[PDB]
Amino acid sequence: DGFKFANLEASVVAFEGSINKRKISQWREWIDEKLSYQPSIIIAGPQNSGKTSLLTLLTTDSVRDYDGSGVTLVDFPGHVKLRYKLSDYLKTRAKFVKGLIFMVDSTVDPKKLTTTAEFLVDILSITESSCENGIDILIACNKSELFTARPPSKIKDALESEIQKVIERR
Amino acid sequence: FKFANLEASVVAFEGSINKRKISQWREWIDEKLYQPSIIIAGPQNSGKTSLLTLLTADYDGSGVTLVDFPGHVKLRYKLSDYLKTRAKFVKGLIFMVDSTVDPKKLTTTAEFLVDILSITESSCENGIDILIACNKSELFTARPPSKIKDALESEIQKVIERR
C-alpha cells in the first residue's frame, strides 16, 4: 500500500501554531528538544510560508571553520556560500543537524496541497538518504487561528495522500 | 563573443596560490572593495578555499526556501537573488582558472563562465566586473594571462554556437 509518514526512517510530528498571534509554544518545545559545529535545525518552505517571521520570533521573543566541500560560489569577506546544496550541508554537519521544519498552511486548498507535497518529496528524498534514521521532521501547521483551519492530524493525513499521488505521477 | 563587448570590465592576471604570490589579485580586490563584497567562482579544486585563507545586516528572506537556525545560513541561495538583494554593494566576481589548460578542461570552464556571466550581466546596467584569476602561473606548462583569456573567449563562442 501507499506512502505513510509512519514508515519514513525519521520521526515526523505535526503541530499547529500561529505566527500572527505569536502562539508557537509547541514548535518551540520541539525546537528546544532538538537543539566542529553547534546543533542546528532547518526551516523549509516556499515564499510567504512564514519563515522570516518565525526566525524573528525565535531570536527576539524568547527570554534568552570554513569548509569548501561542494561550493562553486562563495563571497568575501562574508564567506557566504551560494547554491549551497542541502545534501552538502547535511554531509558536512552530519550529526549536528537535529531536525527539519516544513512550514505549511492549516487552511490549504487542493491546489496549494499539490505544490507543497512536491516540495516535501524533494526535501525528504534528500534528508532520508543523508544518513541512517534520516532527519526528524516537524510539520509546522501555521495559521491555526483561522476559521478555515484544520487540525494538524488532518493536514498531515492530506499531505500523506497527496504525496502518494505525486509518487504515482512519476 | 568578445570579453570587450560585455557591459562589465574583464581583466586577467597571473598568480600562484602554491607560492603565495597573488599581489595582482589583491590589488584588484582591494580596488573593487551591506558591506562591499566580491564573489569567488570556480569548480572543486580551483583554489577558492586556499584563496580565502590568504585574504582572511538584517536578515532578508527573498528567494529563500531553506534556512538554518540559529545560524540563518541560506541553502540553495541563487546568485540572482544574492545579486538583486545586495545590488551596488557587490563589486566584482573572480573566476578561478588554471593557467595550464588542456583543451578538455576549456569547454567545461567556458560553460561555467557563460552560466555565471549571463546572470551577472543581466543583474544591472554595466553588470559585475570580472577578474580572471590565472592560477598555477609558476608551472612550466603555464600560459600567460592574455592567452588564457583569448582561449576562453574563443571557447565561449563555440559553446554559444550550440544554439
A75 touches chain B (CB under 8 A): yes
Residues in CB range of A125: below 8 A, 6 or more apart: none
Q: Which three cell numbers stand for residue A117?
A: 507535497
Residue B31 CB neighbour total at 10 angstroms = 10
B72 touches chain A (CB under 8 A): yes
B64 touches chain A (CB under 8 A): yes
Min CA distance, A134 vs chain B (Å)?
17
**How far is A99 from B7, CA to CA, in rounded Å?**
45
- Which residues make beta-bridge pairs with B39? A75, B93
Q: b/e map of A54-82 (b: 16 or more CB within 10 Å)?
A: bbebbeeeeeeeeebeebbbbbbeeebbb
CA distances for B20 relative to A32, A88, B40, B51, B137, angstroms: 46, 29, 17, 9, 11
Count CA atoms closer than 13 A to B104's CA, side-chain side. Answer: 2
* Count of helix runs (H) and strand runs (E) in chain A: 5, 5
**How far is B132 from A5, CA to CA, in rounded Å?**
49
Strands A12-16 vs A137-142: parallel, antiparallel or unpaired: parallel
Q: Does domain B1-163 have CATH number 3.40.50.300?
A: yes
For this PDB entry, the determination method is X-ray
Q: Which three cell numbers stand for residue A9?
A: 526512517
Q: Do A72 and B41 touch (CB under 8 A)?
A: yes
**Which phi and psi (to 5°) does residue B28 adopt?**
-60, -45
Q: Which three cell numbers stand for residue B129?
A: 566586473
Q: Do A72 and B42 touch (CB under 8 A)?
A: yes
**At which residue does the C-alpha cell 550541508 appear?**
A89
**How far is B99 from B96, CA to CA, in rounded Å?**
10
Entry resolution (Å): 2.2
Q: What is the dihedral of CA A162, A163, A166, A168, to 10 degrees?
A: -100
Quote the Cα angle for A42-B41-B77, to 5°. 25
**Which phi and psi (to 5°) does residue A26 adopt?**
-55, -40
- Which residues make beta-bridge pairs with A97? A40
Most A CBs within 10 Å, among B56, B69, B84, B95, to test the A interface = B69
B139 touches chain A (CB under 8 A): no
CA distances for B25 relative to B12, B16, B93, B144, B148, angstroms: 9, 10, 11, 15, 16
Which residues on A lie below 8 Å from B52 (Cβ)? 66, 68, 74, 76, 79
User: Was A143 annotated as part of a binding site?
Assistant: yes
**At which residue does the C-alpha cell 551577472 appear?**
B120
Residue B92, helix vs strand vs coil: strand
Count CA atoms closer than 13 A to A64's CA, side-chain side. Answer: 3
CATH number of A1-170: 3.40.50.300
Say which DSSP state A18 is in.
B
Which residues on A lie below 8 Å from B75 (Cβ)? 42, 84-86, 89
